[PDB]
Design a protein around this ligand. Structure first.
Ligand SMILES: *[C@@H]1O[C@H](CO)[C@@H](O[C@@H]2O[C@H](CO)[C@@H](O)[C@H](O)[C@H]2NC(C)=O)[C@H](O)[C@H]1NC(C)=O
Ligand SMILES: *[C@@H]1O[C@H](CO)[C@@H](O[C@@H]2O[C@H](CO)[C@@H](O)[C@H](O)[C@H]2NC(C)=O)[C@H](O)[C@H]1NC(C)=O
Ligand SMILES: *[C@@H]1O[C@H](CO)[C@@H](O)[C@H](O)[C@H]1NC(C)=O
Ligand SMILES: *[C@@H]1O[C@H](CO)[C@@H](O)[C@H](O)[C@H]1NC(C)=O
Ligand SMILES: *[C@@H]1O[C@H](CO)[C@@H](O)[C@H](O)[C@H]1NC(C)=O
Ligand SMILES: *[C@@H]1O[C@H](CO)[C@@H](O)[C@H](O)[C@H]1NC(C)=O
Ligand SMILES: *[C@@H]1O[C@H](CO)[C@@H](O)[C@H](O)[C@H]1NC(C)=O
Ligand SMILES: *[C@@H]1O[C@H](CO)[C@@H](O)[C@H](O)[C@H]1NC(C)=O
Ligand SMILES: *[C@@H]1O[C@H](CO)[C@@H](O)[C@H](O)[C@H]1NC(C)=O
Lengths: 360, 256, 98, 82, 46, 98, 113, 49
């Protein structure tokens, strides 16, 4: 199949790579379980204005995002750096809920890289933002027939804001050459203006409540995790593990590496995970990739015989007519003390021939 | 009860190779790792402050810039913590770090700080540190990092909501206070503060006299400023940073 | 004295190290780890991120194979010269100057 | 990752080309060693009395004392290349 | 202007270590050796 | 008579010129100028357009370096031949025919 | 862009506004305010090379700015570029560290010859 | 452009490989000239006659 022919000439051919598969999946998550206060953020009677948007830190809780889906008048549920359905399977830190009220047409401006008024002078998102934006209509609660003017936006500012920066300074703006000296007048306007929210207006102008969930991915110890249950730890076996949202396939072994108390992960010269410190039990598990190697099929011509031998390159014979060579483990050929000329080259001074297939 | 008691003199010294810290919480052993972070540059100008109270306002507030390297050879009881913020009054949030014999209290409130803040022992009172503290939004109590010749080094960074404090305690044999060699500082706490910090000030402890209301005292400390710099750190067999080269210091280190 | 052979060893390990180093490159994707991409995104966008990683890694591997082939040609020329020296200097006396 | 391999299959026979080129280089190196060193089909051996009219070849002949059966110069060469 | 364009785009020609004068001097030395000394200079003293 | 050396000069300048001309290739982007892309587009879109320019220019530079390496191998073989002629024809009398 | 704007001897036709090189790189421009021609030439750049002996022997270094005249940056001017930190010696020795254009460097301080 | 360099850093050590290859070619040319022409360590001169 590899050579795309029904006749194979005499020689050694590299066909595939043997790799031992994992036997069971182990998930290790922090044992601590606290119901996360999402009710406070999502069910609040009053939200802040866009210029003074409310930021709440979420930490040291286990979050069930399934209920967010179960009850939801949220017309918009848009995630940028993570899948909505994978949130229950991951661990996070730096979780922030930013709540504010904006217009119907301004929901497009709560995005990375957007040019706008509330984007520049009220609420700025970074270009590398990860998380989910939730938007829902709040005409029933955040509007009045006479006009709900409680929500204000910064129309005028000297410079654009930074990401995750709030400006509540009620200082006058100078819109012209003439200085204003803190007094309103010609070409001197107040920066903060109120929205005219009325229920009689159509969609696009109705008040919308927006909550922005912001996360960080794996670059710190995590305190917010999904509802996934912690499994027991197994040693010296090939398993597919999930440590705090980090999935890998390897063997977990005891380690003699003196980790410092802050240190969690471990890395090799390739900056790839080589050890992990479990949150639930503070012990260091060295991570070693499961046994693998290249398979070479040593065969004579199909005209002569159909017998084959396999060489597992760089793999000792105890991790897979068995002969151990420096090249690897040879299965199907019998070592012969007698020395002959090289017929099929194996490597490290070892050659194979057909007489059964012998190795010498 | 704000009273002006501390006068301060300042001199300039060399940083040598002090101020290296672990840039992340990843164990690396026997590798050369190049990282770009806020580091104190090698052989940089560090200000040595002597704060003297003898038994007018002469103790100004220092800038924070992009982060602060702090060092002291004094005992753990004289220097008792720090103050961080912008205006240091009731209109903006501020961070107060106060250590005592049993624990450390890190607390972010709207403190109306005194011009010359100091913790006075008599029990300990913070009425000379601030006159009021309202709308307080953060509190964190933990084991102290000023415990008991011994050089104490700290690195303060204010990055994306977190105030990161790194610390090392090194026994320095009698000689130059800022010694040669490498003593990498370890990450001590990351605090999710999210405030604007442009200015900072050191807190001292003064004892009442009971005989010139406060006992005369002196405190010497070194302040340097972190800059965005690329470092190449050497991680040894046990994961310790034993050496580093600052990539932009000289052409030899740039070649390294 | 033995700088040439060590140089060849130095080039080979460095090439492998560079190829190993190329695994730590995002290549314009959210992460350089495929498992994170699978664990974090739905297949419509995970396919895009995996595509970016695949094209970057494939370009790195083709670059490594190209320099390996060029070095193989240079070493083959040196080996042919060495075989010529073995035939003409060791197995006979040569009248070729130098 | 199986999904990555499935997406990798869309690019065609790039993997086969790279494996074939590396295999060609790998056989080429062995061919180079055969061309340089395997130029005699008889394994000649020196006489047990190493007298050649005053010429000393101890530094280039194999050392019986060493397990590797290498010359002192060859042993030095192997030590000096790492 | 051709060289200027390359320089503007960060492409820099590096000068040869041996200049034309020194290469000419080497050829002159080889010519003097082969004329005055035959092939002796290539195998030892001239 | 002296075409070969002129050819080497001709190839090198042309290769540099081709590499220069690769800077005026859009490679599928809206413009070949980074400034215009940056000023006339929003950061995520500009990022994509710049990354297209980056991959096109990087591919051009890799192509130039690869062809330079192949030509360097050819010139190295010619130089080794020239050194052999210098040793055997100038520094001695050669019995090799032609 | 970014570059020096020197006086130009190029006589533009009245309809032309910019100017380009053989290799399609801008080399000239006409000022909109005053109808004059300027030779846009990009600012000086150089390849910083560091010449050093082993760290086992010494920590002294020399810097070669490739292609940069010495007036545009123990300062010596070579055809390779400007060499700072090495002192030119009229004596001739064998090449230890190659600099280029017949210049080589050695450690005895770092000398260039 | 600083933004282009920031995006270019995502591709890793491609720039290092290109610089290293060109440096190898550049030293190789000098080595080629040294092999061809510097085959004598004595600078001979012709007699005046
Ligand atoms: C050292 O600081 C700690 C923390 O501020 C002090 O402990 C507190 O003391 C107050 C006294 O009014 C108690 O109400 C608190 O419950 C204590 N908190 C804790 C966490 O213990 C302690 O008293 C201070 N020590 C001295 C000598 O002043
Ligand atoms: C050939 O040379 C070897 C080494 O070059 C000689 O061995 C030395 O013998 C002397 C005196 O017997 C000793 O002091 C040295 O330690 C020996 N050196 C080694 C490396 O063994 C040897 O004597 C010479 N002659 C013969 C006939 O073998
Ligand atoms: C949400 O709040 C409403 C009224 O404010 C209350 O009736 C309801 O029970 C609350 N739901 C939850 C889940 O807290
Ligand atoms: C649960 O995890 C915490 C760390 O967050 C640890 O201190 C504690 O010992 C764990 N409890 C158990 C029963 O493992
Ligand atoms: C440190 O700065 C002061 C004032 O800025 C200056 O006088 C002093 O020379 C500097 N020290 C060093 C070592 O450069
Ligand atoms: C921090 O405060 C200073 C002074 O109060 C001010 O100039 C600066 O703009 C502030 N920065 C932010 C990000 O709020
Ligand atoms: C801050 O405190 C004052 C009085 O103590 C109060 O009027 C004001 O509303 C408070 N602000 C916040 C945000 O709590
Ligand atoms: C590293 O750890 C070992 C074992 O704890 C110790 O013997 C050694 O002194 C440490 N330091 C170094 C530099 O090896
Ligand atoms: C534009 O204004 C300048 C400055 O007054 C003047 O010299 C010039 O003649 C005007 N017209 C044109 C076509 O440049």
């Amino acid at each position: 199949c590899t050579l795309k022919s029904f006749t194979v000439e005499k020689g050694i051919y590299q066909t595939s790579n043997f790799r031992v598969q994992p036997t069971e999946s182990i998930v290790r998550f922090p044992n601590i379980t606290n119901l996360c206060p999402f009710d406070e953020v999502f069910n609040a009677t009053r939200f802040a204005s866009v210029y003074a948007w409310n930021r709440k830190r979420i930490s040291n809780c286990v979050a069930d995002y399934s209920v967010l889906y179960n009850f939801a008048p949220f017309f918009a549920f848009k995630c940028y750096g993570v899948s909505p359905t994978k949130l229950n399977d991951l661990c996070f830190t730096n979780v922030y809920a930013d709540s504010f009220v904006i217009r119907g047409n301004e929901v497009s401006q709560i995005a990375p890289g957007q040019t706008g008024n509330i984007a520049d002078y009220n609420y700025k998102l970074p270009d590398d933002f990860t998380g989910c934006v939730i938007a829902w209509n709040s005409n029933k609660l955040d509007s009045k027939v006479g006009g709900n003017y409680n929500y204000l936006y910064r129309l005028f500012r000297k410079s654009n804001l930074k990401p995750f920066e709030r400006d509540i300074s009620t200082e006058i703006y100078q819109a012209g050459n003439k200085p204003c000296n803190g007094v309103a007048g010609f070409n001197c306007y107040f920066p903060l203006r109120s929205y005219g929210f009325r229920p009689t207006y159509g969609v696009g102008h109705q008040p919308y409540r927006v909550v922005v969930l912001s996360f960080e991915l794996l670059h710190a110890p995590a305190t917010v995790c999904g509802p996934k249950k912690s499994t027991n730890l197994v040693k010296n076996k090939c398993v597919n593990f999930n440590f705090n949202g980090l999935t890998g396939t390897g063997v977990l072994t005891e380690s003699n590496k003196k980790f410092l108390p802050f240190q969690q992960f471990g890395r090799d010269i390739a900056d790839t995970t080589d050890a992990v410190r479990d949150p639930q039990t503070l012990e260091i598990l060295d991570i070693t990739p499961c046994s693998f190697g290249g398979v070479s099929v040593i065969t004579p011509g199909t005209n002569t015989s159909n017998q084959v031998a396999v060489l597992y390159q760089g793999v000792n014979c105890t991790e897979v007519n068995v002969f151990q060579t420096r090249a690897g483990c040879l299965i199907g050929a019998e070592y012969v003390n007698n020395s002959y000329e090289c017929d099929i080259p194996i490597g490290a001074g070892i050659c194979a021939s057909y007489q059964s297939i012998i190795a010498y | 009860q704000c009273v002006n008691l501390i006068t301060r003199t300042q001199s300039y010294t060399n940083s040598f190779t002090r101020g290296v810290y672990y840039p992340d919480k990843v164990f690396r052993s026997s590798v050369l790792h190049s990282t770009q972070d806020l580091f104190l540059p090698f052989f940089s100008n560090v200000t040595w402050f002597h704060a003297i109270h003898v038994s007018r306002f002469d103790n100004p507030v220092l800038p924070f810039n992009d982060g602060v390297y702090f060092a002291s050879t004094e005992k753990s009881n004289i220097i008792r913590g720090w103050i961080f913020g912008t205006t240091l009054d009731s209109k903006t949030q501020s961070l107060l770090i106060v250590n005592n014999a049993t624990n450390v209290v890190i607390k972010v409130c709207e403190f109306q700080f005194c011009n010359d803040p100091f913790l006075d022992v008599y029990m300990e009172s913070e009425f000379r540190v601030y006159s009021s503290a309202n709308n307080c939004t953060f509190e964190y109590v933990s084991q102290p990092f000023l415990m008991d010749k011994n050089l104490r080094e700290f690195v303060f960074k204010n990055i994306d909501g977190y105030f990161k404090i790194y610390s090392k305690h090194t026994p320095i044999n009698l000689g130059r206070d800022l010694p040669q060699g490498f003593s990498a500082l370890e990450p001590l706490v990351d605090l999710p503060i999210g405030i604007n910090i442009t200015r900072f000030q050191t807190l001292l402890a003064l004892h009442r006299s009971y005989l010139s209301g406060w006992t005369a005292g002196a405190a010497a400390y070194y302040v340097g400023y972190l800059q965005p710099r690329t470092f190449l750190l050497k991680y040894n067999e046990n994961g310790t940073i034993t050496d580093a080269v600052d990539c932009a210091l000289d052409p030899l280190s740039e070649t390294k | 004295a033995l700088g040439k052979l060590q140089d060849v060893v130095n080039h080979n390990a460095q090439a492998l190290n560079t190829l190993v180093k190329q695994l730590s490159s995002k290549f314009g994707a959210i992460s350089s780890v495929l498992n994170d991409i699978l664990s974090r995104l739905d297949p419509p966008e995970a396919e895009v991120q995996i595509d970016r990683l695949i094209t970057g890694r494939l370009q790195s591997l083709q670059t490594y194979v190209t320099q390996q082939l060029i070095r193989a040609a240079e070493i083959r020329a040196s080996a042919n010269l060495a075989a010529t020296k073995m035939s003409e200097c060791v197995l006979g006396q040569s009248k070729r100057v130098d | 990752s199986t999904e990555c391999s499935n997406l990798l299959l869309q690019y065609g026979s790039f993997c086969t080309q790279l494996k074939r080129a590396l295999t060609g280089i790998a056989v080429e190196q062995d061919k180079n060693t055969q061309e340089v060193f395997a130029q005699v089909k008889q394994i000649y051996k020196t006489p047990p009395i190493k007298y050649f009219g005053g010429f000393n070849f101890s530094q280039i002949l194999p050392d019986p004392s060493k397990p590797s059966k290498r010359s002192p110069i060859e042993d030095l060469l192997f030590n000096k290349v790492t | 202007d051709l060289i200027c364009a390359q320089k503007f785009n960060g492409l820099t020609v590096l000068p040869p270590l041996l200049t034309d004068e020194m290469i000419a001097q080497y050829t002159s030395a080889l010519l003097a050796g082969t004329i005055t000394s035959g092939w002796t200079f290539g195998a030892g003293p001239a």
